[PDB]
Each structure stands twice: as structure tokens, then as C-alpha cells.
Ligand SMILES: NC(=O)c1ccc[n+]([C@@H]2O[C@H](COP(=O)([O-])OP(=O)(O)OC[C@H]3O[C@@H](n4cnc5c(N)ncnc54)[C@H](OP(=O)(O)O)[C@@H]3O)[C@@H](O)[C@H]2O)c1
């Protein structure tokens with residue numbers, strides 16, 4: 311299975327200055343639950359933002375840099391390489407990867423951040439005419455998680 315995993319705000323903002331615009335621990339819990347024991351494919355900038363491979367899953371980085379060889383990370387140099395990866399593969403960002411893959415993936419696991427943030431990178435437009443809502447679950451708010459958010463699982467029609 312090939313899936314997108316993304317958090318985007320009401321205007322599809324996903325990033326600002328190579329980091330997430332929001333602090334939302336619940337989204338990370340969501341990422342952990344979905345991707346632990348599976349595979350993440352990410353662009354080079356996204357990887358450098360995180361700074362290290364995420365534990366307990368396969369981390370694959372897409373880059374044109376032929377000098378890229380980082381411990382605990384597998385490297386690929388083409389979109390076509392993604393299709394050779396076994397198991398459940400999650401496209402993990404950033405904007406360039408999402409743009410390249412939104413028409414190819416089976417489904418999407420979106421955290422809708424129900425706010426309007428300043429962004430410099432965006433998730434591409436999509437329409438519910440193309441995507442069935444498999445589930446929609448409101449995130450619980452507390453002291454640590456103060457921005458309303460909704461977890462959507464969309465499946466291509
Ligand atoms: N909210 C979210 O769900 C989320 C998730 C991930 C990232 N982000 C945000 O997204 C932003 C980064 O997005 P971005 O688009 O600037 O960068 P990105 O997608 O993370 O990485 C871009 C880089 O990926 C490589 N790449 C992409 N397609 C390639 C291809 N077909 N062949 C070879 N290399 C390819 C290139 O690396 P080289 O230049 O090294 O060749 C390219 O410069 C940041 O603000 C980050 O915080 C948000």
C-alpha cells in the first residue's frame with residue numbers, strides 16, 4: 311500500500327522556514343501509531359528538518375545528491391524507486407514529494423489543523439469528489455494540545 315501522511319491547516323499550509331508551523335504533540339502520536347514498523351519516504355529538506363531517521367521504521371530519503379549516505383537511512387534518487395519498496399509505504403513530505411505523489415497514492419492520512427498559519431509550503435489542492443472519507447476523527451484538546459484538529463483517512467474513489 312502507498313499512502314500519503316500529512317498535517318495541513320485550513321488553507322493547506324504544511325510548513326514554514328523548513329519546520330512545522332504548529333506545536334501539536336497529538337499529531338506526532340498519530341504519526342508514531344501509523345508508521346512504526348513501516349516505511350517513510352521523504353524529500354531531502356524534510357529529512358534535514360528532522361535531523362535524524364525516526365526510530366522503529368524504515369526511513370527512505372529522496373535526493374539528487376549522489377553523496378548522500380546517512381547511517382540508518384536508505385537513499386533513493388528517483389520517484390520510480392518508491393514503487394520497488396515493499397510493505398506499507400507512507401509518503402512523508404514535503405511539498406515537492408506531495409505534489410509528485412498525490413495522483414499516485416492509494417489513500418491519504420491527513421491531520422487537518424483547524425487553524426490559519428503563516429506558511430511557505432503547501433499541500434496541493436484536492437477535492438472530496440475524488441476521495442472517500444473512510445474516517446474522520448476529532449482530536450482531543452487538552453493542556454498540551456490546544457489547536458483543534460481532525461484526523462481524516464481518505465481513500466481514492
Ligand atoms: N505538515 C507536514 O505534513 C509536513 C511534512 C513534511 C514536510 N513538511 C514541510 O515541508 C517543507 C519542505 O518541503 P519542500 O518541498 O521544500 O522539500 P522536500 O519535499 O522535503 O524536499 C525537497 C527535496 O527533495 C528532493 N526531491 C524531491 N523530488 C525528487 C526527485 N524526483 N528526484 C530527486 N530528488 C527529489 C530534492 O532534494 P535535493 O535538492 O537534495 O536533490 C528536493 O530539493 C518544510 O517546511 C517542512 O516543514 C511538512
Ligand SMILES: CCOc1ccc(-c2cccc(NS(C)(=O)=O)c2)cc1-c1ccc2c(N)nc(N)nc2c1
Pocket residue numbers: 315316317328329330337338339341342343356359360364401402403420421
Ligand atoms: C518537517 C518537520 O516535521 C517534523 C519534525 C519532527 C517530527 C518528530 C519529532 C519527534 C519525534 C517524531 N517521531 S514520531 C513520534 O512522530 O513518530 C517526529 C515530525 C515532523 C513531521 C514530519 C512529517 C509529518 C507528516 N508527513 N505528517 C504528519 N501528520 N506529521 C508529520 C510530522
